[PDB]
Design a protein around this ligand. Structure first.
Ligand SMILES: *[C@H]1O[C@H](CO)[C@@H](O)[C@H](O)[C@H]1NC(C)=O
Ligand SMILES: *[C@H]1O[C@H](CO)[C@@H](O)[C@H](O)[C@H]1NC(C)=O
Ligand SMILES: *[C@H]1O[C@H](CO)[C@@H](O)[C@H](O)[C@H]1NC(C)=O
Ligand SMILES: *[C@H]1O[C@H](CO)[C@@H](O)[C@H](O)[C@H]1NC(C)=O
Lengths: 211, 541, 219, 541, 211, 219
């Protein structure tokens, strides 16, 4: 059964660059190779079939080539929309097989995060536990520290972070950090601070509140 | 010599030159009398013994004008033997001009006139304080001249935002003490003042109201926030186009396209809605950004734009860079002899980042497209940082007003107003007595008013356009004892670089030293003479 | 309008069975090839099975052959994936995709339209519906906090799909407690607060929860 | 029927078949008498009324052998009218064979003989306990038969490592209760026993010493450590070639190259020093790994090797996979009808990872190269996980011995030893009375000895090679009340898949149910009959 | 002054892959382009000059091509040793300029970390402060959580992590985590635990000690 | 043996001056081109200046032209980089590299050998030497803890260069206190403890510290 092997498995590049990604069938597969594009949380879309034919609606910046066992997909001028994982398939054997995928991230200039803090809404306070959320909006690159501080005291890994994939328009990231505490813990204290550190910020920014 | 500017805190006389001897023929004087703050007024009282040539005041006369400069309202134009009546200012300044072309002349007394209006002016120390037009939320009183000042400790930025603002009548914000520090904006509409962050130490508002029909007024609020930049810190941070810290107000252009769909406010890097396009494509159009404070500029990033209506790509292929500390005196960035042309974009979506080889200290920036494809369309980011982002590097108060006139001394003037020596604030500059003096002999001196650690200075030229090219620096705790900063290579006093332009300032750093008094000694300079404005950088012990 | 809508996904004990369905709309699934393709979370695409309804011709990937049966019912224009003897490595999003091979050799085995997929979770843990709190506020941030649920996924829209610009819905994070939680948030102009209403639309199909929470900000 | 295996805890008689009636001609019996544990011995006492045919014991005789099986030492070979003398075991087993080819025969009494040696055997509960050969650090006593057992709570692995080990005389480690659970190793040299991690619940050592010249002995140490695998957990973890959790001992080969520079121990993925190469390249060489415990195998990764001496590249191009639960009965992985040949490497440094399409439950793994370039050289990783990595999935005690013989019942045997039903441990398997029975009529039953949550079973075949192909399962709290596991599709009892081989077990999971007794009902099976070994999976409430 | 622009700016690939990296001069630069290899903490080494000529000692898997304004460097079969940042230079103008660099990481199979814990040596205890270090050796991929626990209590960001670059032989990572406390804090408590989580570990591994 | 050894690097106040040196060994630097190339931490290579000693011909990158002067002294077979009016963006590792252009057009401006570089740090902070503690222990881990120093770098070898296999020296991390700290560690066989000695070789040139610590493990 025919194995497909893609390279590189991930890469990053700047809007405007000419990107090229590679695919090797483990046996002669003629020109029966297709390429699909998968954007985050969406179903994949066909780009190219029979090695070099563009599918309807696919912009002319995409193109493909090869035969036998070596196939390449080129983007001639990467756009932010093109952030996605790209897969080759062989359409030669009785059983289709896909390559392992190539993740294409985007490089861009440093962008500073907008920070917002969120207190727990009464509705929740009723249920016992309490969730304070810290929002870092639209920054780049992805590296960023978010230290919580309860009464000026550095807190543990009882916080949780989540990050978004790169935005398809501005290529930035967003991040949420949530700290969960009990009735007894949240009620008993007053000073709750979120301190964000990030390359694009000249100095640490702090957002905080009281009950 | 006759003429001059007089503080009315002291009552004083002003007379025609030789009074009561007949005044000189064919010679004109002019004085400005002024009160400490807009709250007070000035009254003039002429002596009854008054003699100017008659005819119909065609030749000799005294003119008094309401406010300042020759274009202010004519309070009165007099001659013959009957002295003017008492004259009272509508503001806190009068302008007087005696003109001559025989007769004993005139004499007057001046002093401050007091209206009885309040001293509503509040200072602010508090971390979380608020400020508003007195009487708020109800209507604001008539005839109000009020100053609200926020003072801040060493490493703490003042944040100032506005909740409502509706209002002849005006509010203006100052990067320091009012009418000394630079103006940052005069507001008087329905549009609220955009947020302000400031690392100066001082920020002040000036509220002015009239007799006629008050509006809803204004309410605002301020925070002081600590800022510790690192050691490992590089001055390449984005300044606020994409993030919005540079607010819409701050962005402006030479002109904009007719349909209103390509405004200055759309020139933000990565904006989803077209970009800025001028009314007509040529190389004399510009987009401008007012950073509001003196900022280091280290890089520019630019983009084209794709029309949302028609999907057509437009982009600037090359541009020039004009900077200015005041919005009036401009300098085109240079690469050796001639203007530097930056290579910009080659499609409508890539970002192309140009690092200045020479970091620039400035306030206003202008991008001027030179070539383009299909049309001029820009989106833009600026990168840099503030002077105060380096350890112990605070502006010690020439720019702001925190170092009073009475703390600035000069070897020799050709006049005097010490406020003319101030970095940026000043509208002229310090000139010596003999413009083309001898090197190492003329000097300019600041009294910091306390022992400080001094880490550098910022030198600027003067507007008669001239500027220092090289200088030495000396310092003292006392006033009579003086060490020069030494080059450990030559073991002679170190020769610093001055300016290459009369407006665009330059920052020189040196090893930390103790000093309450600092001096700067011009060594080489420009043709026109020794022009100089100045500021000193350091901190407390 | 070709549409493919998968259904049947959910929680299922190891060893158990589950039956996925792919409703075709817009076209008649006979005379096409219908493929199943799955994607384990964070990993790549793996082809599973196919069926050509006209002929009845089917085949399977070795990793599932034996355990899975593909079938079609052309009267209902639907296709099915009966799964048996399931295990943890069967956990994945399953997609149906159309192949259009008739008279086009170049397009053989090429999958030209895909459905949005359905998540199958092979776990011993129990269904638990979420609890949905607000995150109350020239720029403002507001969001929803969808806490404590199992299994994935939950979907969040705003103003029933009308509000999309500025929206950021996070990946769920597994808690110590064994449940999931995510947040959705959107940034709007802070001038239009008090005028414009902002309701978020939470939906967790595995536990039949369909909540709508109204997000809103001394005398 | 005559013959059989007898627990000597009860004293019992053994006689020739009809005794004292003349014994049958032309027919042979054999019994094994045995004590509970190696500590005790067995004594035999013959009745004086003894009659076997004379001549020179060429035809009829009784043989007693020291230990077990026909190849043990001849304690005595007797006939005529004079009974054997009292005979005492050197171990804890005797083997007796009566052979016939007229005469009253024989009768004997058996019982356990007691030496007075200690009951040194210690059980272990403690989290941080240690264990050693009594008398340590000084020399260990003669004639010692001791069992050290570590018992562990539900989700806690036993870690066991050794500080020193020097020693006819031996130590053996058991994956459960000694001589019931599988052996994992017999140690008796200077080389210390490699670390052991075990998720069984039980681990036991058996120390045996002789009369002659004691060595330094052994000291060791153990920890119990908690293990919570997640929900979101995939059974693709590396098993220990690169990390070294698979210790050198565990790696072995059919043969190795003559210069000693390409040993089994060098076959670790990414090793810096050559790899394994056999004495002679052919497709009947193998590298073997003994995982020690039943482990799920889900993937194999392989590499070639570059000679450190000569920089020449060698790599296997394809291989086959043999697995086994005991190291004796082997199965070549299949892809439908025929053997699966895996495609391996195409240069000496890339890693090529082959996921089994069918995950395998096994203990020993063999890689058998089929083609190669320039020579056979391997480095290897194995991926998988342990059965107990899934929630509530503990082995309930058939394999280990924790479910005693007296808790295993069968519908009908053809003999009995209940220990023959045990997964892996057993050397035979459970056969029914009529090998080729009727479906849904024959069954095998475990008494868990308490209400448990039961989540699956693991079915194996039997060695006469045969195995179940399909089965049903029923459960009970009581013993007389029985529900079958239902398919929610057919609404008839669910038909599970059995095995495709007599050794390689298969794991079937089902929705959680309460039960203290579980039953398995064969439906289809292999030609030879119904062979079965079994284990049950679940946890406590 | 001639600007060089490399793409992608980073990529990851598997030992054995054929990698290709790209370079665009901002004006015709003929075949005067060189490529250098920089390994972590070392000085760069010349690989290729005049666009396509191999420098002495450079293995034949490297090659280059191009003219005018487009230049490519290919590795035909990536080895672990080849982890490095690669730079193009133009050698045409009076002033040399380098491209921005392309970082080549390596993809490989999951490898589990070996954990070790280190108590503070008396020598330090004398100076007042106390440093407990946790070592995670030779794992992959780089993602890994290291939570400290003082008397079974989750600790803050008063710990610090450092990670190594990929090892040039096995492509793995190593990580240290250090927690610093005072005399009064370390002396007063007994239970100090390092709990490591990582993909290659079936369950969290804990290493701990007492004084 | 061509060798290039840079020296002169260290801490220097903003505005100050510093002078780097590149000792050539093995060849006569006249008749070559000598280039300076710098690399700000974590960023790329930037060409700075060059000099052809025979001719005296020099040139400079715009970002330094004005502030830096390159020179050579062929009698001492060394080259120099006088730096003035320094600022934070001058912080970087500086490398000298040889170009060999005579009769080889293809090799013009190609830099065929480089030195190992010297780190220049433009900071107002103060020099501080490190404090070097041991990290005491079929596989054992032992290391050194080099705590509290400024500026970078520190170098660590083991057994004076003899022990290299299994060594992992970490990147330094900046502490809250403003100082640096790293650890070095090496994994050996745990059989050979008590026999083999293990000393680590710390060295912080900016503060003239050259320590050697001996790492070693109730009656
Ligand atoms: C602020 O305080 C007072 C009263 O507001 C006023 O004299 C002056 O504006 C400030 N203080 C001084 C003297 O600097
Ligand atoms: C500031 O506002 C008031 C005092 O003016 C006070 O009640 C409030 O707590 C202060 N906010 C803080 C703590 O920053
Ligand atoms: C362990 O305890 C005792 C004494 O060691 C012994 O009877 C047996 O081996 C174990 N316990 C039982 C009866 O399972
Ligand atoms: C285990 O060893 C002894 C008791 O046998 C005890 O002193 C020691 O503290 C124990 N170790 C721990 C706490 O795990």
């Amino acid at each position: 059964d025919i194995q497909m092997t893609q390279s590189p498995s991930s890469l990053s590049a700047s809007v405007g660059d000419r990107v090229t990604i590679t695919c090797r069938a483990s046996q002669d597969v003629s020109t029966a190779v297709a390429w699909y594009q998968q954007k985050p949380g969406k179903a994949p879309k066909l780009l190219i079939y029979s090695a070099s034919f563009l599918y309807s609606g696919v912009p002319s910046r995409f193109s493909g080539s090869g035969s036998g066992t070596d196939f390449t997909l080129t983007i001639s001028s990467l756009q932010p929309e093109d952030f996605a994982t790209y897969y080759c398939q062989q359409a030669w054997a009785y059983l289709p097989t896909f390559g392992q995928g190539t993740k294409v991230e985007i490089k861009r200039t440093v962008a500073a995060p907008s920070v917002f803090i969120f207190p727990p809404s009464d509705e929740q306070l009723k249920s016992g536990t309490a969730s304070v959320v810290c929002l870092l909006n639209n920054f780049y690159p992805r590296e960023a520290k978010v230290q919580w501080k309860v009464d000026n005291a550095l807190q543990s890994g009882n916080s949780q972070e989540s990050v978004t994939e790169q935005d398809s328009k501005d290529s930035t990231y967003s991040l949420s950090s949530t700290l969960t505490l009990s009735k007894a813990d949240y009620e008993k204290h007053k000073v709750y601070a979120c301190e964000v550190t990030h390359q694009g910020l000249s100095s640490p920014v702090t957002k905080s509140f009281n009950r | 010599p006759c003429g001059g500017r007089l503080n009315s805190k002291d009552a004083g006389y002003i007379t025609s030159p030789g009074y009561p001897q007949d005044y000189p023929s064919h010679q004109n004087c002019e004085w400005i009398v002024y009160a400490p703050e807009p709250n007070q007024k000035i009254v003039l009282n002429f002596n009854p013994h008054f003699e100017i040539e008659k005819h119909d005041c065609k030749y000799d006369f005294i003119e008094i004008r309401d406010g300042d400069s020759e274009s202010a309202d004519l309070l009165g134009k007099h001659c013959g033997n009957i002295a003017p009546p008492t004259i009272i200012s509508s503001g806190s300044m009068l302008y007087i001009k005696f003109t001559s072309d025989q007769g004993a002349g005139f004499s007057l007394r001046y002093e401050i006139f007091k209206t009885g209006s309040e001293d509503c002016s509040k200072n602010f120390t508090s971390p979380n304080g608020t400020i508003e037009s007195p009487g708020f939320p109800e209507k604001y009183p008539h005839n109000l001249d009020c100053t609200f000042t926020i003072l801040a400790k060493p490493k703490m930025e003042i944040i100032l935002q506005f909740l409502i603002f509706d209002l002849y009548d005006w509010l203006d914000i100052w990067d320091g003490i009012p009418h000394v520090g630079p103006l940052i904006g005069k507001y008087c509409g329905t549009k609220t003042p955009s947020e302000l962050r400031s690392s100066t130490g001082i920020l002040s508002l000036t509220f002015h109201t009239d007799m006629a029909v008050a509006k809803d007024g204004f309410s605002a609020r301020y925070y002081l926030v600590h800022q510790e930049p690192l050691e490992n810190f590089q001055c390449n941070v984005p300044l606020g186009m994409e993030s919005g810290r540079i607010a819409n107000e701050q962005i402006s252009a030479s002109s904009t396209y007719s349909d209103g769909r390509w405004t200055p406010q759309q020139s933000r890097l990565h904006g989803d809605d077209n970009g800025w396009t001028p009314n007509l494509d040529s190389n004399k159009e510009y987009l401008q950004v007012d950073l509001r404070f003196l900022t280091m500029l280290t890089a520019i990033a630019t983009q084209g734009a794709i029309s949302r209506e028609t999907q057509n790509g437009y982009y600037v292929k090359s541009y020039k860079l004009e900077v200015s500390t005041n919005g009036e005196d401009w300098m085109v960035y240079r690469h050796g002899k001639n203007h530097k042309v930056f290579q910009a974009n080659n499609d409508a979506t890539e970002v192309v980042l140009n690092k200045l080889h020479a970091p620039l200290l400035t306030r206003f920036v202008r991008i001027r497209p030179q070539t383009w494809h299909s049309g001029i369309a820009l989106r833009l980011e600026l990168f840099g940082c503030r002077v105060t982002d380096a350890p112990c590097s605070n502006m010690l108060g020439m720019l702001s007003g925190l170092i009073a006139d009475s703390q600035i001394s000069a070897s020799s003037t050709q006049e005097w107003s010490p406020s003319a020596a101030r970095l940026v604030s000043s509208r002229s500059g310090w000139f010596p007595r003999i413009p083309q003096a001898q090197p190492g002999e003329e000097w300019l001196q600041v009294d910091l008013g306390t022992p400080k650690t001094v880490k550098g200075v910022i030198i600027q030229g003067a507007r008669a356009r001239a500027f220092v090219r090289k200088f030495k620096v000396s310092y003292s705790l006392n006033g009579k004892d003086w060490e020069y900063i030494q080059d450990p290579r030559t073991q002679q006093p170190k020769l610093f670089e001055g300016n290459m332009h009369y407006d665009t300032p330059d920052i020189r750093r040196f090893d930390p030293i103790p000093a309450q008094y600092v001096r700067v000694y011009p060594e080489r300079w420009s043709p026109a003479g020794i022009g100089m404005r100045l500021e000193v950088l350091g901190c407390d012990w | 309008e070709v549409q493919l809508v998968e259904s049947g996904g959910g929680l299922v004990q190891p060893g158990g069975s589950l039956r996925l369905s792919c409703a075709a709309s817009g076209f008649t699934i006979s005379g096409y090839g219908i493929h199943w393709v799955r994607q384990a979370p964070g990993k790549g695409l793996e082809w599973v099975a196919y069926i050509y309804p006209d002929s009845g011709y089917t085949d399977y990937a070795d990793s599932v052959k034996g355990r899975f049966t593909i079938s079609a019912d052309t009267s209902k224009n639907t296709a099915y994936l009966q799964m048996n003897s399931l295990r943890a490595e069967d956990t994945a999003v399953y997609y149906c995709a159309r192949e259009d091979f008739r008279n086009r050799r170049r397009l053989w085995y090429v999958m030209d339209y895909w459905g949005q997929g359905t998540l199958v979770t092979v776990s011993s843990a129990s269904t638990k519906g979420p609890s949905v709190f607000p995150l109350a506020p020239g720029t403002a941030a507001l969001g929803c906090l969808v806490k404590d649920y199992f299994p994935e996924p939950v979907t969040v829209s705003w103003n029933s799909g009308a509000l999309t610009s500025g929206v950021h819905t996070f990946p769920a994070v597994l808690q110590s407690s064994g449940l999931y939680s995510l947040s959705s948030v959107v940034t709007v102009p802070s001038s239009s607060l008090g005028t414009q209403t902002y309701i978020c639309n939470v939906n967790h199909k595995p536990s039949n929860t369909k909540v709508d929470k109204k997000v809103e900000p001394t005398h």
